[PDB]
PDB file of C-alpha atoms and ligand atoms in Angstrom:
ATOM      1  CA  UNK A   1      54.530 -10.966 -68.409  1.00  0.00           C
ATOM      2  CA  UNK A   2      57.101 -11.426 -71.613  1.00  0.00           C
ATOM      3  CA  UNK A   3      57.334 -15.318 -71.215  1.00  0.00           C
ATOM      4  CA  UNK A   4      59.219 -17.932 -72.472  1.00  0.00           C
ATOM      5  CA  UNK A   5      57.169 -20.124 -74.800  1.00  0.00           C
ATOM      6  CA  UNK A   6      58.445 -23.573 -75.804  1.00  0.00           C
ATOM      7  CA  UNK A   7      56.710 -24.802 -79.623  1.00  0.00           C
ATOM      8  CA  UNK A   8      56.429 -28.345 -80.440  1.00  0.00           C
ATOM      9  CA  UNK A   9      56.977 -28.387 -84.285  1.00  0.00           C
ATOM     10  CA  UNK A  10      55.014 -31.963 -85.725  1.00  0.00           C
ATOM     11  CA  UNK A  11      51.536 -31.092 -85.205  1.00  0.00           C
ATOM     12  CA  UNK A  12      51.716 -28.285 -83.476  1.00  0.00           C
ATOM     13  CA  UNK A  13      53.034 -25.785 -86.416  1.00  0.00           C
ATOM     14  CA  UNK A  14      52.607 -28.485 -88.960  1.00  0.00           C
ATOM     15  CA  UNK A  15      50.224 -30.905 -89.855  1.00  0.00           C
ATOM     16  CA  UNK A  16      52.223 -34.664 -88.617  1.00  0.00           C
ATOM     17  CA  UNK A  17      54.214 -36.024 -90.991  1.00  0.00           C
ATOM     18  CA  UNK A  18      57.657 -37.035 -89.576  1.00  0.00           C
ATOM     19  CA  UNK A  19      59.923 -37.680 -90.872  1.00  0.00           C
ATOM     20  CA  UNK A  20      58.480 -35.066 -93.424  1.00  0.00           C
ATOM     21  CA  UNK A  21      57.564 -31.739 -92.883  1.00  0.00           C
ATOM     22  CA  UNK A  22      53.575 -31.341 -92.938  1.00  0.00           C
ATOM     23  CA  UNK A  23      51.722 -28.382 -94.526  1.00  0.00           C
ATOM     24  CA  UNK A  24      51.491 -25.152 -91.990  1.00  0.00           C
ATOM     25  CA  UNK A  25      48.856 -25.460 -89.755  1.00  0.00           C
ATOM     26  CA  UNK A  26      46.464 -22.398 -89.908  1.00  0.00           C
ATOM     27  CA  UNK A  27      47.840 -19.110 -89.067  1.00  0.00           C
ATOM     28  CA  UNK A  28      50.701 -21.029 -86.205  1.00  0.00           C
ATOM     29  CA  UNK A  29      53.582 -19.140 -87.884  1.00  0.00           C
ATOM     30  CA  UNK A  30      52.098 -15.900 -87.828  1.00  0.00           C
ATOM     31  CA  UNK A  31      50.862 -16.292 -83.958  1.00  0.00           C
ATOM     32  CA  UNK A  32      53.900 -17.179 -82.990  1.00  0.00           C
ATOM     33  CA  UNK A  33      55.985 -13.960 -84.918  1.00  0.00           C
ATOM     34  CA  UNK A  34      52.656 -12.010 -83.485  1.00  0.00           C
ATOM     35  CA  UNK A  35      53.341 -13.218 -79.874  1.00  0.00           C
ATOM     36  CA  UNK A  36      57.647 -12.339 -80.574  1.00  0.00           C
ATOM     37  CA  UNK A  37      55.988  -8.938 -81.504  1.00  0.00           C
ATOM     38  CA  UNK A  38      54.991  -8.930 -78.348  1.00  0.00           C
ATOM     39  CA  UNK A  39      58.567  -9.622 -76.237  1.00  0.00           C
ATOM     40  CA  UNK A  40      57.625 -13.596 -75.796  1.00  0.00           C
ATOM     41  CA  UNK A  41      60.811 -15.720 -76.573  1.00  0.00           C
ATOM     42  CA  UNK A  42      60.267 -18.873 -78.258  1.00  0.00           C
ATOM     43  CA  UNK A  43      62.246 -22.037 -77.968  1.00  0.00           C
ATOM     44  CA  UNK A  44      61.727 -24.866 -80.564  1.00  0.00           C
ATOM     45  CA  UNK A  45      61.419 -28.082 -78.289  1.00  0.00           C
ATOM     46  CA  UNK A  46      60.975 -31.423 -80.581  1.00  0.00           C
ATOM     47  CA  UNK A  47      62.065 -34.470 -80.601  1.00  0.00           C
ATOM     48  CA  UNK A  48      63.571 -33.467 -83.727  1.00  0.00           C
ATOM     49  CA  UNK A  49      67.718 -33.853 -83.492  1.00  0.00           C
ATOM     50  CA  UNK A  50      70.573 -33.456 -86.028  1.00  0.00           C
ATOM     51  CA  UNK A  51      69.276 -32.710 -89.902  1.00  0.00           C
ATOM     52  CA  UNK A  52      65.546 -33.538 -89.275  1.00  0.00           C
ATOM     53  CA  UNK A  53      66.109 -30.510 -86.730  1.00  0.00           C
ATOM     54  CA  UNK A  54      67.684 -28.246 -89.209  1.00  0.00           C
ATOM     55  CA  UNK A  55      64.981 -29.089 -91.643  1.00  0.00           C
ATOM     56  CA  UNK A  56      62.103 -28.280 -89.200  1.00  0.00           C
ATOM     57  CA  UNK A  57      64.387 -24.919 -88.471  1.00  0.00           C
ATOM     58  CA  UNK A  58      65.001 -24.094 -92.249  1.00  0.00           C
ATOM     59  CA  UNK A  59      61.287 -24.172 -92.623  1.00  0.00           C
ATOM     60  CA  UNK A  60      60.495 -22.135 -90.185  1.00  0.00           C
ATOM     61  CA  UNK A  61      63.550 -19.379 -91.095  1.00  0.00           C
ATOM     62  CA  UNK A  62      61.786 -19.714 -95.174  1.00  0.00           C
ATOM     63  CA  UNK A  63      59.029 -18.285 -93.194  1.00  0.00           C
ATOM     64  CA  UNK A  64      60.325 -15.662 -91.475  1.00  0.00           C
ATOM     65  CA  UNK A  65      60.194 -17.305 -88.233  1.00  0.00           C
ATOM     66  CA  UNK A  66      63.186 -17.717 -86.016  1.00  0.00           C
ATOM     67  CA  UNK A  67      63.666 -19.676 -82.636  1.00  0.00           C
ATOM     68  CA  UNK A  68      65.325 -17.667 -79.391  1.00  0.00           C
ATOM     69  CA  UNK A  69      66.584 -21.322 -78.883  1.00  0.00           C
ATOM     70  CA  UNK A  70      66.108 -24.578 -80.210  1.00  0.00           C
ATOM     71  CA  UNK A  71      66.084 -27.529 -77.705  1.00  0.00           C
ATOM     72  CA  UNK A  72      68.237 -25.397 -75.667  1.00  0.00           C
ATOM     73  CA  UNK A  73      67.603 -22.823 -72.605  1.00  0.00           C
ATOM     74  CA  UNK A  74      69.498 -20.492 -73.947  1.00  0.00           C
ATOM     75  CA  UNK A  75      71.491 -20.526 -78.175  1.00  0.00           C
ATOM     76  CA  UNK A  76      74.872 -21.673 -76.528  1.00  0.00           C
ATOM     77  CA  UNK A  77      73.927 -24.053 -73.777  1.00  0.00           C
ATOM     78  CA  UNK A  78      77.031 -28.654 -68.378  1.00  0.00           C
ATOM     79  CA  UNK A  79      76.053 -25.282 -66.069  1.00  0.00           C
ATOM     80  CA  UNK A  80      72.111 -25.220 -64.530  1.00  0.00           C
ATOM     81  CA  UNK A  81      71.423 -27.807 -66.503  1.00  0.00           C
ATOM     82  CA  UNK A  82      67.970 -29.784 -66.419  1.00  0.00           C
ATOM     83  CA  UNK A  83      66.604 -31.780 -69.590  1.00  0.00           C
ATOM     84  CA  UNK A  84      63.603 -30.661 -69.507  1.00  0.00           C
ATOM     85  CA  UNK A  85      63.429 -26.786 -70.719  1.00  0.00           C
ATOM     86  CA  UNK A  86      62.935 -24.254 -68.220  1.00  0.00           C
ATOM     87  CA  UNK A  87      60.615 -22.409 -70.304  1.00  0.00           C
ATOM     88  CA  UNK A  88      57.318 -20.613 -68.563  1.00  0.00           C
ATOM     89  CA  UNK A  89      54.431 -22.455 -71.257  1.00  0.00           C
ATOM     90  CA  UNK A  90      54.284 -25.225 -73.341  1.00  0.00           C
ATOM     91  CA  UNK A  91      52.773 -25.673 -76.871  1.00  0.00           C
ATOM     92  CA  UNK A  92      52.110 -29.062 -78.001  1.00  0.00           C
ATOM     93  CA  UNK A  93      49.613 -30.962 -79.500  1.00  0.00           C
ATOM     94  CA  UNK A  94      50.483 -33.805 -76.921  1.00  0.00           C
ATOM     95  CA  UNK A  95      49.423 -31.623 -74.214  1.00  0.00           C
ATOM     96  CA  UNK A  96      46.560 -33.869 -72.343  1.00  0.00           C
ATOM     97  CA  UNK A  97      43.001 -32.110 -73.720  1.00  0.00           C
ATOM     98  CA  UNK A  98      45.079 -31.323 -76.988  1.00  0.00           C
ATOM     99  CA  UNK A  99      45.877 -27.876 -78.458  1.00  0.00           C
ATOM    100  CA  UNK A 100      43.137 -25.306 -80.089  1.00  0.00           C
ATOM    101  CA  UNK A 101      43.669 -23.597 -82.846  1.00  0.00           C
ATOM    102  CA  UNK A 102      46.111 -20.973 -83.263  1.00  0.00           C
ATOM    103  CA  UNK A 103      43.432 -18.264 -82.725  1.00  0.00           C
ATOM    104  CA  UNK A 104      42.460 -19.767 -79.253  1.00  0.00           C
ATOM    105  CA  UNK A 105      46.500 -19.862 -78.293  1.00  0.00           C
ATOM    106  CA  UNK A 106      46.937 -16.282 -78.635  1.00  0.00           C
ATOM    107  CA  UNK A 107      44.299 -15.494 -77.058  1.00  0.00           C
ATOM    108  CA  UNK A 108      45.277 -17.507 -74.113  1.00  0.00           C
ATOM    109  CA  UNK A 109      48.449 -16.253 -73.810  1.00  0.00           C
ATOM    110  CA  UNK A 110      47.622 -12.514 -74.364  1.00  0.00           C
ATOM    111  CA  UNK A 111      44.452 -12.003 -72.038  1.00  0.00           C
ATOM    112  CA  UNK A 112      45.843 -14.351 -69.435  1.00  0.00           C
ATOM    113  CA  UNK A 113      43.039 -17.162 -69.820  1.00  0.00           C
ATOM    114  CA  UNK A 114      42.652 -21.018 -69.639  1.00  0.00           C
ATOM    115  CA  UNK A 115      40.361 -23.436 -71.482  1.00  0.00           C
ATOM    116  CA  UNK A 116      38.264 -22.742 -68.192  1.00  0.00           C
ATOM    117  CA  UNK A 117      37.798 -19.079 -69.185  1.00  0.00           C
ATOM    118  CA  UNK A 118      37.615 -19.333 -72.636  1.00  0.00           C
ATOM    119  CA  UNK A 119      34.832 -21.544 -72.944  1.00  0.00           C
ATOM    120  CA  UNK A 120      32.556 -20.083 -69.913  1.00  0.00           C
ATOM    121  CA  UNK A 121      29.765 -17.990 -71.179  1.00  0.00           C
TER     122      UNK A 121
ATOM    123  CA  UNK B   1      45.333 -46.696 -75.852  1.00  0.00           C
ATOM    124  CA  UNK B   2      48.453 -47.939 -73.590  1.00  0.00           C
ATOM    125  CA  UNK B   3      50.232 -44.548 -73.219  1.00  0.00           C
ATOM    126  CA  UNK B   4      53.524 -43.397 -72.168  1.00  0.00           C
ATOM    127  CA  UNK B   5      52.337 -40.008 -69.879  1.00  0.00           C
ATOM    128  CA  UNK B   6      55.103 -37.416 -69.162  1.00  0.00           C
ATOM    129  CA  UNK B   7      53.816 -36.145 -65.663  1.00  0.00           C
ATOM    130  CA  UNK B   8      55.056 -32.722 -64.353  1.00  0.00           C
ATOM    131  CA  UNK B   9      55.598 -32.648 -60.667  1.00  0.00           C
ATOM    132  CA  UNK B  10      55.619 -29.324 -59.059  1.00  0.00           C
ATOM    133  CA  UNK B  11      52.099 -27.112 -59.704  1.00  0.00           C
ATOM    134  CA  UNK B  12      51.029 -30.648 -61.210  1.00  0.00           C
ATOM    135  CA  UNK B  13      50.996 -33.336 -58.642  1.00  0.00           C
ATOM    136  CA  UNK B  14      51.729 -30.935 -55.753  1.00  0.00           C
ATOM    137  CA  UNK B  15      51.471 -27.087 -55.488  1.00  0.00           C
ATOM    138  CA  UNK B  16      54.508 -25.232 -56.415  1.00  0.00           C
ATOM    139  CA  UNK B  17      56.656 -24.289 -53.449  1.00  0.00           C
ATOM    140  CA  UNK B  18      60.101 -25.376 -54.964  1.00  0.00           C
ATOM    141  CA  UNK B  19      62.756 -25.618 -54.023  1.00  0.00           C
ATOM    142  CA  UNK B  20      60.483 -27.547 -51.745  1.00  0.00           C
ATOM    143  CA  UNK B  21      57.434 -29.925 -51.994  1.00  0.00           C
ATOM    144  CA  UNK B  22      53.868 -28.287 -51.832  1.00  0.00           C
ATOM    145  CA  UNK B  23      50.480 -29.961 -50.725  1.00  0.00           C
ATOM    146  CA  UNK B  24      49.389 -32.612 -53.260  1.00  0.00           C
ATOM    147  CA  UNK B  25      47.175 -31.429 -55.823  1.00  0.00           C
ATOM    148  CA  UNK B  26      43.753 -33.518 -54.809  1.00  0.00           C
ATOM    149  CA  UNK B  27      43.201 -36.968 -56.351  1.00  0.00           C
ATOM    150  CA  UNK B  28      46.754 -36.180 -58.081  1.00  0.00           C
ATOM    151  CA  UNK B  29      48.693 -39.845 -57.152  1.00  0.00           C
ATOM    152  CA  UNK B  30      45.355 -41.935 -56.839  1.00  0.00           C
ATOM    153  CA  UNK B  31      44.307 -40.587 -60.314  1.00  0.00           C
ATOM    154  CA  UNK B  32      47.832 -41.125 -61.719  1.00  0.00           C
ATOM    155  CA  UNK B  33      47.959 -45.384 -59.951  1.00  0.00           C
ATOM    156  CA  UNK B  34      44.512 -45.438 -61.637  1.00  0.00           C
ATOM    157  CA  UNK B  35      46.081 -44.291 -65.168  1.00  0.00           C
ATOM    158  CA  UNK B  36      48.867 -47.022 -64.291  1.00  0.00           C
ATOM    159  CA  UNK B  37      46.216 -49.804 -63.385  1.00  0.00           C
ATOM    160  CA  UNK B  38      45.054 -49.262 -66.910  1.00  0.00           C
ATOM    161  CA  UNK B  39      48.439 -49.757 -68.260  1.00  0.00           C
ATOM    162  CA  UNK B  40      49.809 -46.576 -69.031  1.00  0.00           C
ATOM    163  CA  UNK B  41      53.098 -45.536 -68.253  1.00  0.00           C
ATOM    164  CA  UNK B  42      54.314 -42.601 -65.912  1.00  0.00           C
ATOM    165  CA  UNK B  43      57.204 -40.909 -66.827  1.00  0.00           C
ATOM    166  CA  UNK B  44      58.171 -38.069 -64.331  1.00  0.00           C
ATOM    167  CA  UNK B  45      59.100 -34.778 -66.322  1.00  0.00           C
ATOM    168  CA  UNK B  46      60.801 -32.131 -64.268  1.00  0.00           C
ATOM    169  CA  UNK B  47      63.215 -29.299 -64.204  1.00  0.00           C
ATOM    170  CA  UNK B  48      64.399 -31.009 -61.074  1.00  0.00           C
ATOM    171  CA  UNK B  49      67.879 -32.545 -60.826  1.00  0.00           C
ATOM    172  CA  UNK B  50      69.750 -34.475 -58.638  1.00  0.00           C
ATOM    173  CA  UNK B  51      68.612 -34.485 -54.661  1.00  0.00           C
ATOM    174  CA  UNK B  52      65.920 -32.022 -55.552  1.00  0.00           C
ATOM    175  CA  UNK B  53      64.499 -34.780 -58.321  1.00  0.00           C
ATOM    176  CA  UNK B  54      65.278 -37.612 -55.446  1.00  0.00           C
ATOM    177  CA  UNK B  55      63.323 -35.518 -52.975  1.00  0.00           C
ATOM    178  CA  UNK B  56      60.462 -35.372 -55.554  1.00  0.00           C
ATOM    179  CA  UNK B  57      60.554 -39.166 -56.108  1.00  0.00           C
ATOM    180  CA  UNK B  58      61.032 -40.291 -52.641  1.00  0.00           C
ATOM    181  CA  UNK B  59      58.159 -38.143 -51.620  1.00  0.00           C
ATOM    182  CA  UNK B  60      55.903 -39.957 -54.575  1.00  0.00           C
ATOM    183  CA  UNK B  61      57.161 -43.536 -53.421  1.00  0.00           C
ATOM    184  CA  UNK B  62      55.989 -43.368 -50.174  1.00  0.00           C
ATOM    185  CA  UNK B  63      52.368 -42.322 -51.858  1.00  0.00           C
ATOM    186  CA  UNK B  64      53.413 -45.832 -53.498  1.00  0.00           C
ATOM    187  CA  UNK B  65      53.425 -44.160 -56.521  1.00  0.00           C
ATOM    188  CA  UNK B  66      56.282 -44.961 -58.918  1.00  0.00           C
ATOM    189  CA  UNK B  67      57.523 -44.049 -62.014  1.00  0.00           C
ATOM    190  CA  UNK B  68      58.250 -46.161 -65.343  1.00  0.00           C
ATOM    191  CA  UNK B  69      61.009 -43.483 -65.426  1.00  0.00           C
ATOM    192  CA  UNK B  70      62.446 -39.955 -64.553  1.00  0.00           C
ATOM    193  CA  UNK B  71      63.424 -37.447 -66.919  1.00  0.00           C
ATOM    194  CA  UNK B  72      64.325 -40.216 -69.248  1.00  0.00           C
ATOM    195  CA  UNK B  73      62.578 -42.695 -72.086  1.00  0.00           C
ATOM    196  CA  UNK B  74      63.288 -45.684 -70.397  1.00  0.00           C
ATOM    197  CA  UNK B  75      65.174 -46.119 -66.709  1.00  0.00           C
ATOM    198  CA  UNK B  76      68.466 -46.557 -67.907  1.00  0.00           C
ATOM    199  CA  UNK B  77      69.389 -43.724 -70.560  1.00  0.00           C
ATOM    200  CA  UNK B  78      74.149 -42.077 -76.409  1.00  0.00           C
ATOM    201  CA  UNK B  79      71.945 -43.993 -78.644  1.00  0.00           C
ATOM    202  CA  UNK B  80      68.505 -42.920 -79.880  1.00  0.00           C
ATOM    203  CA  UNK B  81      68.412 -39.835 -77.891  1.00  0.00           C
ATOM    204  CA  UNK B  82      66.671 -36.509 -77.969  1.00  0.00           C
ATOM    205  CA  UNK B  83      66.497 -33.990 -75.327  1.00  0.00           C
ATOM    206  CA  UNK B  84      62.298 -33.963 -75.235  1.00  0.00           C
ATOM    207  CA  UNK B  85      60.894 -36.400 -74.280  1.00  0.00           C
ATOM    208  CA  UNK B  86      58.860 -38.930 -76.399  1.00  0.00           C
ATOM    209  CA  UNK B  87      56.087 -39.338 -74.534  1.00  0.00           C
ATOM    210  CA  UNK B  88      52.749 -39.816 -75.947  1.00  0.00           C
ATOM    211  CA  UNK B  89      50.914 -37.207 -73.561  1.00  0.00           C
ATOM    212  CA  UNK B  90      51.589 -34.496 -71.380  1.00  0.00           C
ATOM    213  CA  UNK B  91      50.276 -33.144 -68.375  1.00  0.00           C
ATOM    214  CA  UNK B  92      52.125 -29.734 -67.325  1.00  0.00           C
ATOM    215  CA  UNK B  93      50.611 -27.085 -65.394  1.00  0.00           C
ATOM    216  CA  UNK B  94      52.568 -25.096 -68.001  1.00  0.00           C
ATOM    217  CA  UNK B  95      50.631 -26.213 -70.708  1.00  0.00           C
ATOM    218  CA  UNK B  96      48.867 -23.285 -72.516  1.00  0.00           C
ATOM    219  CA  UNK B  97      45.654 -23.142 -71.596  1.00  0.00           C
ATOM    220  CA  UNK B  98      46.301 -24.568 -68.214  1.00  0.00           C
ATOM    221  CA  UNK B  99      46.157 -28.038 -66.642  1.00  0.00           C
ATOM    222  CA  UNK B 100      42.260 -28.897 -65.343  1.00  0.00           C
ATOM    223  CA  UNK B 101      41.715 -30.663 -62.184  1.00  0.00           C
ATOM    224  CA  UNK B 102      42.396 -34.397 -62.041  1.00  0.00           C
ATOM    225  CA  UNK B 103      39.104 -35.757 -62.672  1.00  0.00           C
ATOM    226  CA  UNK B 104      39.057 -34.090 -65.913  1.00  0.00           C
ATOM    227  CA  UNK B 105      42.698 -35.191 -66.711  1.00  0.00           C
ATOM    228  CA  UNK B 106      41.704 -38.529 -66.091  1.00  0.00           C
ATOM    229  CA  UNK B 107      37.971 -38.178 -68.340  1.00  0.00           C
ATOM    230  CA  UNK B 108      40.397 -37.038 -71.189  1.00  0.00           C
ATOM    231  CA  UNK B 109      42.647 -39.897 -71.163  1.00  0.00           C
ATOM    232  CA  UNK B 110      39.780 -42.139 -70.470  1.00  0.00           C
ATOM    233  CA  UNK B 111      37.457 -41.444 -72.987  1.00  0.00           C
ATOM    234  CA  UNK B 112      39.675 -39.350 -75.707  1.00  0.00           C
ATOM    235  CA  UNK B 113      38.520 -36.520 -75.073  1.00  0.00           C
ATOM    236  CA  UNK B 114      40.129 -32.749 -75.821  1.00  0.00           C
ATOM    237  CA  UNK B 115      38.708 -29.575 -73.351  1.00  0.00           C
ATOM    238  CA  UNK B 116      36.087 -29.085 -76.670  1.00  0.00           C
ATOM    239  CA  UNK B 117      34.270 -32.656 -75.965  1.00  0.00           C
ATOM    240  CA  UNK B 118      34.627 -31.311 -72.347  1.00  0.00           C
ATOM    241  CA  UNK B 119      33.031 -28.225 -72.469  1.00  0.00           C
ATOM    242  CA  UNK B 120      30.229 -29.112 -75.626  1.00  0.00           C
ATOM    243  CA  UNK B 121      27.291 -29.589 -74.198  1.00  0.00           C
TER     244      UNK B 121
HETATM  245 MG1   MG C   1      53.747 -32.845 -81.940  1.00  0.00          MG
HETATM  246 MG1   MG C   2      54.977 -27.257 -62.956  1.00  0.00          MG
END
């Protein structure tokens, strides 16, 4: 119901331009604060380590926008350890079929659809 | 166009029943031998550890499926690391929006093709 939501940053908040930080891509930082409005955790999950991590977090912080976790289960993180985060749905725009647009996300995720749903008519 | 494909297993290739191993999804390890006949890689991508993750790749070996790697960028894992992955794709029943049924997976890959080519008519 409240879910744990893990956000790709390059190309999936911003436009891909790693090692750089892209421009925002539409409306992604205020879906995501929307969707903490509404009790969802999310975890920052990139590839990102070390100071290219703390840049993509800085960025998103300058925006208001702040991460239950990043790359971790849980802000102190071994115990019940896996690699892969345990988190209940993935945002990325390496997903197979790609992502939609931010609009199309939320929507998703708050009436409990799938590309299936939204696109039958 | 060769790929390196992160592959969930459980609700992906079988149906969830973990701690143990559901039915296989259909056409789940013929479509991913296919995706390796055309050169892509399979890299397994689960929460499971130890004899669980064993259990999940002994079960896909005798399907004579077998992985590039498991829960790592290359089969013997530091140096370059980062906790996610750097797959090129992935296919996660967890993925917003939902994970379609193989034949579509495979369409996707194929042809480069996102759920909008899909669905457009
Ligand atoms: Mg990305
Ligand atoms: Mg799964």
């Amino acid at each position: 119901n409240a879910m744990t939501i893990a956000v790709d940053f390059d190309g999936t908040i911003v436009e891909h331009r790693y090692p750089r930080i892209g421009e925002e891509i539409p409306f992604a930082v205020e879906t995501l604060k929307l969707l903490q409005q509404e009790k969802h955790r999310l975890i920052l999950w990139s590839v990102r380590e070390g100071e290219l991590l703390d840049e993509a977090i800085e960025w998103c912080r300058a925006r208001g926008l702040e991460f239950y976790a990043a790359n971790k289960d849980y802000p102190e993180e071994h115990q019940g350890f896996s690699r892969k985060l345990k988190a209940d749905l993935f945002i990325d725009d390496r997903n197979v079929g790609g992502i939609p647009d931010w609009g199309i996300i939320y929507e998703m995720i708050k009436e409990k659809k799938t590309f299936a749903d939204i696109y039958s008519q």
